[PDB]
Structure 1
Amino acid sequence: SVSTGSAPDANTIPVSKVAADRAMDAAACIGCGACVAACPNGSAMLFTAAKVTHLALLPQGQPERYQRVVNMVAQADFEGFGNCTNIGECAAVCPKEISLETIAQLNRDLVMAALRGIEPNTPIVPA
């Protein structure tokens, strides 16, 4: 949630090369939805996990990360996707080879947010 014109200098916050590489691995998600299609539960776990991991691995995504995951997960529940039985077909059919480590990162983030008592916001209603 950064508006235009308020950004500091690009080099102000150092992001380690490994964290940037992992965030680019997660951010390389074309939104095709093949993870939902090959998931036996019809779950958006890989897509949500990829976005959550991409934003969580950078220092700019920290201030709202533990809210974000909860909200995003809630939205995936509201939209009508299934749950993650950790089957792993999503990573098998992912065009961009997004790993299940993204789902583990989302799980860690959601556990930590539950420890912080983070409550999901009102879901995004279709227009």
Structure 2
Amino acid sequence: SVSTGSAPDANTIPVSKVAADRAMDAAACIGCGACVAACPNGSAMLFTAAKVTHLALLPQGQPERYQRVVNMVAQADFEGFGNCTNIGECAAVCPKEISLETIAQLNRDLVMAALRGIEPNTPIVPA
């Protein structure tokens, strides 16, 4: 949630090369939805995990990560997607070779968000 024109200088916040590379790896998701169709449970866990990992490995996403994941997770549960059995078809079918570790990252964040008492907001109702 950054408005236009309020951005600071580009080189203000340094980001390590490893973190930037992992964020780029997680962010390269074309949104094809093949992970949902390939997953036997029909879950969108890989897509949400990739987005959360991309937005959580950079400092700019730090102030609102713990809320964000919960909201995203809740939205998935509201949208009709299934649960994740940790089978692994998502990574084997994903065109951009997104590793399963992103899901683990998401899990960790959610657990931390559970510890701090974060509650999901109202779901996004389609128009």
TM-score, structure 1 normalization = 0.99
Shift of 1:19: 0.2
What is the rounded CA distance, in whole Å, between the counterparts of 1:44 and 1:11 in structure 2? 35
Runs of 4+ off more than 3 Å: none
What is the rounded CA distance, in whole Å, between the counterparts of 2:125 and 2:23 in structure 1? 29
Q: Deviations over 1:86-121 (max 9, x none)?
A: 001000000000010100000000000000100000
Task: Specify the alignment match of 2:89 in structure 1.
Answer: 89
What is the rounded CA distance, in whole Å, between the counterparts of 1:109 and 1:126 in structure 2? 27
CA root-mean-square deviation: 0.4
Question: Structure 1: which 5+ runs fail to align?
Answer: none
Tell me the SS of whatever aligns to 1:19.
helix
Q: Deviations over 1:57-100 (max 9, x none)?
A: 00000000000000000000000000000001000000000010
What is the rounded CA distance, in whole Å, between the counterparts of 2:111 and 2:99 in structure 1? 19
Shift of 1:123: 0.5
Asked if 1:119 corresponds to 2:116, the answer is no
Shift of 1:26: 0.4
Q: Deviations over 1:12-50 (max 9, x none)?
A: 000100000000000000000000000010000000000
What is the rounded CA distance, in whole Å, between the counterparts of 1:124 and 1:62 in structure 2? 23
Q: How many residues align?
A: 127
